[PDB]
């Protein structure tokens, strides 16, 4: 029902983006098992050499589906997400989070 | 009376941001003594590991208070500011300057 697209902007260079991705690798199976989660995928740009593509190498884009806002909010308080946030605090600069419905 | 917030964007890496901060260290006491100056503080992001914070490592945020636009404009013509501008010309990319009043 809700679709979340979250862009996580990482610090340039020094394998910061990979550090974050590695933290997601630890957590994604767990998140998929959370109540109300119907998708949770960290994505990165893939250079297709087409003129219409825009790329941001220092970013990870999450695509997620949650049954409700309550389920998303619960997600954010889980220990795996608190552990994730602590683990990536020196790697992440900001997040831009959209909550979307069918248009 | 006027509050100025100026974001100074610096060149990535190569201690450019520190070079600029060092130039501010030279000038801040002088600026505070300028007529009509009631605050002049170069600030940087401080990573608090909270999800709601946005950080830009290649930026310095000035928070200032000036008694009037004339006082600010005079500030910009002082020798310490002309010397500052010359000193940082290879370190700074741009500035975004807001002049604010109580809402
Ligand atoms: C604040 C915040 C932190 C996250 O780690 C996070 C992870 C996945 C989806 C959304 C979010 C979010 O809104
Ligand atoms: C153009 C310009 C240059 C500065 O160096 C500067 C320094 C402090 C406050 C404002 C400014 C400003 O508007």
Kindly report the CA angle at A62 between A41 and A48, in degrees rounded to 5? 85
Distance between start and end Cα atoms, chain B: 12
Contacts of B50 (CB under 8 A, 6+ apart): none
Residue of chain A minimizing CA distance to B53: A94
Ligand 1: residue whose CA is nearest its atom 13:
A97
- Domain segments of chain B as ranges: 1-103
**Cβ–Cβ below 8 Å for A95 and B53:** no
Method: X-ray
CA dist., res. A60 & res. B82, Å (int): 42
Type and span of the H or E element at A77? none
Q: Give phi and psi for B98, each to the nearest 5.
A: -110, 140
Nearest ligand to residue B37 Cα:
2
Picking from A101, A43, A97, A92, the residue whose alpha carbon sits closest to that of residue A73 is: A97
CA dist., res. A37 & res. A83, Å (int): 19
CA dist., res. B64 & res. B88, Å (int): 19
Strand order across the beta sheet in which A59-66 lies: A37-43, A59-66, A2-10, A92-100
B49, B55, B57 ranked by CB distance to A85: nearest: B49
Kindly provide the resolution of this structure in angstroms, with one decimal.
1.7
Q: Which CATH class is domain A1-103?
A: alpha beta
Picking from B30, B15, B44, B34, the residue whose alpha carbon sits closest to that of residue B84 is: B30
Q: What is the dihedral of CA B59, B65, B67, B73, to 10 degrees?
A: -10
């Amino acid at each position: 029902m809700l679709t979340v697209i979250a862009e996580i902007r990482t610090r340039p260079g020094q394998h910061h983006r990979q550090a974050v991705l590695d933290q997601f690798a630890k957590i994604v199976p767990t998140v998929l098992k959370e109540e109300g989660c119907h998708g949770y995928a960290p994505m990165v740009d893939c250079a297709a050499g087409v003129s219409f593509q825009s790329m941001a190498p220092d970013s990870i884009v999450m695509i997620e589906q949650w049954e409700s806002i309550a389920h998303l909010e619960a997600h954010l308080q889980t220990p795996h997400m608190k552990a994730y946030s602590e683990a990536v605090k020196g790697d992440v600069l900001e997040m831009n989070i959209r909550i979307l419905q069918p248009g």
